[PDB]
Amino acid sequence: TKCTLKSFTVEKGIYQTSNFRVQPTESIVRFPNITNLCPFGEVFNATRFASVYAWNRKRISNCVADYSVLYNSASFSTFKCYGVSPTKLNDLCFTNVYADSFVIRGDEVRQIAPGQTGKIADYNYKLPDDFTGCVIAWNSNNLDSKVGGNYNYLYRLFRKNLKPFERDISTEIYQAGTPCNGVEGFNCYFPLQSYGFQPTNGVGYQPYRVVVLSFELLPATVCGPKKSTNLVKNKCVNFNFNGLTGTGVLTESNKKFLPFQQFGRDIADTTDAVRDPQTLEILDITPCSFGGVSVITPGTNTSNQVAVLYQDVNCTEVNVFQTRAGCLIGAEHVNNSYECDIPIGAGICASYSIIA
Amino acid sequence: GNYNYLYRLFRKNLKPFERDISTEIYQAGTPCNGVEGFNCYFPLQSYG
Amino acid sequence: QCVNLTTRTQLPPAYTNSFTRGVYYPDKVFRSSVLHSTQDLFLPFFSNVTWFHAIHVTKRFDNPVLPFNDGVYFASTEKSNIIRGWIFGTTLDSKTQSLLIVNNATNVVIKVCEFQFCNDPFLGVYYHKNNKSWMESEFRVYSSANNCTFEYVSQPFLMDLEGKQGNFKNLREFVFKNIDGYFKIYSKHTPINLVRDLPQGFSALEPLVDLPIGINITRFQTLLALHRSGDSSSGWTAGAAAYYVGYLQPRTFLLKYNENGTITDAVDCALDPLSE
Ligand SMILES: *[C@@H]1O[C@H](CO)[C@@H](O[C@@H]2O[C@H](CO)[C@@H](O)[C@H](O)[C@H]2NC(C)=O)[C@H](O)[C@H]1NC(C)=O
Ligand SMILES: *[C@@H]1O[C@H](CO)[C@@H](O[C@@H]2O[C@H](CO)[C@@H](O)[C@H](O)[C@H]2NC(C)=O)[C@H](O)[C@H]1NC(C)=O
Ligand SMILES: *[C@@H]1O[C@H](CO)[C@@H](O)[C@H](O)[C@H]1NC(C)=O
Ligand SMILES: *[C@@H]1O[C@H](CO)[C@@H](O)[C@H](O)[C@H]1NC(C)=O
Ligand SMILES: *[C@@H]1O[C@H](CO)[C@@H](O)[C@H](O)[C@H]1NC(C)=O
Ligand SMILES: *[C@@H]1O[C@H](CO)[C@@H](O)[C@H](O)[C@H]1NC(C)=O
Ligand SMILES: *[C@@H]1O[C@H](CO)[C@@H](O)[C@H](O)[C@H]1NC(C)=O
Ligand SMILES: *[C@@H]1O[C@H](CO)[C@@H](O)[C@H](O)[C@H]1NC(C)=O
Ligand SMILES: *[C@@H]1O[C@H](CO)[C@@H](O)[C@H](O)[C@H]1NC(C)=O
Ligand SMILES: *[C@@H]1O[C@H](CO)[C@@H](O)[C@H](O)[C@H]1NC(C)=O
Ligand SMILES: *[C@@H]1O[C@H](CO)[C@@H](O)[C@H](O)[C@H]1NC(C)=O
Ligand SMILES: *[C@@H]1O[C@H](CO)[C@@H](O)[C@H](O)[C@H]1NC(C)=O
């Protein structure tokens, strides 16, 4: 109170100096159940994949996509791209996901990248300069490689440039300049080529299953996992309910919310009750105890004794005397009645030890 | 290509006017225990 | 394949007076025993709404062109659930994505998808005479689709499909809005005991669904069902039904919420000086 009054001498009276408030602890976030999982399981690990020039297109929307499980599996050899990071991606939501899956060779992994040129990057599949998303490649020796020779995979090798994200199912014969009239012979070779993967082939020629995931933005449909936490009551808590952030203590609520209503607002447009999505439970939010602090002194010229009054605070959780004006500490309550000297309030006064 | 200039790429905040001369490996997730491989990459990259 | 239906007499469109209907919850906020003023797209009180009939008595098969300005209030007065579905779009000729909602005999289908929509799409229920069983038999809406983005099919169920005789006993109210790329469909059901009118009183239209579609909608149409037991375009019966279509405008409404939390009554801020 000396600092508050900007003086070293304090006259007898009551002064409001500070404001006691309960700090919030155990911040909690609650989100609805993660029960919308579109089948990501077999889009990456299926029975068989198509050729690189006949890559399949997979459309993903309205899903709850979690990429932490893909990253921490550690069973996938290739994981590297720019624009996005392995962490913090779960907190980013995108409108749509495009998936392109195929099988390439060991040396083909280097060619498939934005800004990189090559025969595959020019005749089979190319990426835009502003590409969003990236590619994941994993070894498939135990599945794609077959003893005796596998020729089910075919890639374009002769072509006259390709637009980004372009599919060319047609494999019309290529002319190098006397026209062959669509007949195999001179100046007209086979435009495609097989792979012929063998078990004896090393890391440079072993098969690799490749999936490219791209995100486009311009309403968002597929978001992150949105993990939740535990629920605790009877404490001043920072709560995050469905993105709504607030501070307060939860308690049992007798209000009956309608099925389509999540949170409730009373008069003056402030949150009063909220229904958590996990267990359809309605809880009343009330602010945790706070209030001003009043310093009662008989004057520095008289004595240095001090009484502390917490205004409208049930200070059972922090010479304690509780009245409807709050709670006073440091003064002995007496059953007598004298003329008021320091007006505390609500019919309660203090005077000089300090008595109330 | 000139590769004598380096910049930090991966790191865990940084205060204003703070110097970080240490280039210890950065773990983004089974820990590699300071060994180059999965779940960790070198934090320095060259402009070239 | 679809064939245009003939034998439909031309009669001028009918307009009917809507009395304190078309009121819905502005948001998902619970309020108890309080007066709240909110500005939103609403249907004005005591307005004029376009009324379409369906009765054998011609046969009064009403599937005309209807624009979609800012939102649609659709009331269906029925005794046998003749109305089937709704279609939303801009071009309606496979060059732009569209939206389709159909409640057939077993499921409920919502497709955000491109269709080669016919000029006269409809449903058809065949009423067998050898045995008593009303079942859907014909569905002439779309031809084919190459691209398609959103599909939703509800759990299978059973429906009556029989045409009862008497006065109307069911009223299905819907509100369709499209704002910020979100399509909101609000629905309510009400029993009635009238022959032809729009019921008075107050009814709060609770929310039903919120699709994140984000497509432009400036044109919508309805889909009914016809009974069968003539030619392909002459031997059909519409069945007794009616539906009212109204347009929503940005208005300020004052709503009273009771202790139950539901909407009790509402007044406008631009209808008459007393309400303002
Ligand atoms: C129903 O009538 C409409 C218009 O009267 C028919 O639409 C015509 O379709 C043909 C071929 O599909 C086009 O060449 C015409 O230009 C269309 N008419 C107009 C005005 O655009 C429609 O084919 C009819 N449905 C039938 C016969 O099943
Ligand atoms: C009502 O519509 C639904 C949705 O199309 C129909 O359910 C499909 O029926 C076809 C044909 O039997 C099946 O191939 C699909 O697998 C069904 N989809 C499901 C079950 O999600 C249903 O058959 C229609 N009902 C009637 C009476 O035509
Ligand atoms: C295949 O990929 C899916 C991705 O959803 C993953 O869950 C699964 O564990 C993988 N299986 C193998 C054998 O790698
Ligand atoms: C959410 O999941 C929990 C755990 O299974 C379950 O107890 C609860 O009923 C679920 N709530 C909803 C709304 O699905
Ligand atoms: C209070 O002030 C008076 C004069 O202002 C002085 O004589 C007296 O000593 C002071 N009290 C104390 C305890 O110092
Ligand atoms: C709040 O104050 C009242 C005084 O009437 C007291 O009985 C009660 O125990 C206090 N609350 C708590 C949690 O201590
Ligand atoms: C309480 O007040 C009564 C009546 O004034 C008095 O007789 C009693 O001694 C008082 N007790 C205490 C502990 O002050
Ligand atoms: C009917 O609707 C029209 C608009 O189409 C409106 O001008 C008119 O006031 C309404 N009422 C009557 C009685 O015509
Ligand atoms: C009985 O009614 C069904 C309609 O649900 C119809 O398909 C069937 O043909 C009828 N039985 C005979 C013998 O016609
Ligand atoms: C389908 O989407 C592709 C992708 O852009 C587009 O080129 C095509 O015009 C769309 N419509 C049809 C009928 O393929
Ligand atoms: C809707 O119309 C606006 C007009 O500015 C256009 O920019 C937008 O691409 C359209 N959206 C669709 C899905 O057609
Ligand atoms: C809620 O509605 C019921 C009737 O369903 C009524 O009895 C009750 O008084 C209303 N108000 C409440 C429960 O606060």
Residue numbers in the entry:
A (entry chain A): 299 to 458, 460 to 476, 478 to 518, 521 to 620, 641 to 674, 691 to 694
B (entry chain C): 447 to 458, 460 to 476, 478 to 496
C (entry chain B): 14 to 70, 76 to 247, 252 to 298
Could you pull the original sentences from the published paper?
Host cell entry is orchestrated by the viral spike protein that, upon binding to ACE2, mediates fusion of the viral membrane with the host membrane. The ectodomain of the heavily glycosylated spike protein forms a trimer where each protomer consists of a core S2 subunit and a distal S1 subunit. Each S1 subunit comprises a receptor-binding domain (RBD) that can switch between an exposed “up” conformation and a “down” conformation, where the latter is inaccessible for ACE2 binding. In particular, sybody 23 (Sb23) binds to recombinant RBD as well as to the prefusion spike glycoprotein with high affinity and shows very potent neutralization activity.
Interestingly, the cryo-EM reconstruction also reveals that the spike bound to Sb23 displays an unusual conformation where two RBDs are in the “up” ACE2-binding conformation. In the pool of particles that enabled a high-resolution reconstruction, approximately half of the particles had one RBD “up” (1-up) and the other half a conformation with two RBDs “up” (2-up). To the best of our knowledge, the latter conformation has rarely been observed for the SARS-CoV-2 prefusion spike but is commonly observed for the MERS and SARS-1 spikes. In both main conformations and for both “up” and “down” spike protomers, Sb23 binds in the inner edge of the ACE2 interaction interface of the RBD thereby effectively hindering ACE2 binding. Interestingly, ACE2 binding to the “up” protomer is hindered in the “1-up” conformation also from Sb23 binding the neighboring “down” protomer. This interprotomer-mediated blockage is true also for the corresponding “up” protomer in the “2-up” conformation but not for the 2nd “up” protomer in this conformation. Hence, even if the blockage of ACE2 binding in the “1-up” conformation from two independent sites may contribute significantly to the efficacy in neutralization by Sb23, the interprotomer-medicated blockage is reduced in the “2-up” conformation. The “2-up” conformation of the spike naturally confers extra avidity with its two binding sites for ACE2. We can at this stage only speculate if the binding of Sb23 itself induces a conformational change that results in the “2-up” conformation or if Sb23 promotes a conformational stabilization of the “2-up” in the spike’s dynamical landscape. Clearly, this conformation makes epitopes accessible for the development of therapeutic binders in the central cavity of the spike, this includes the lower portion of the RBD and possibly also the central helical region.
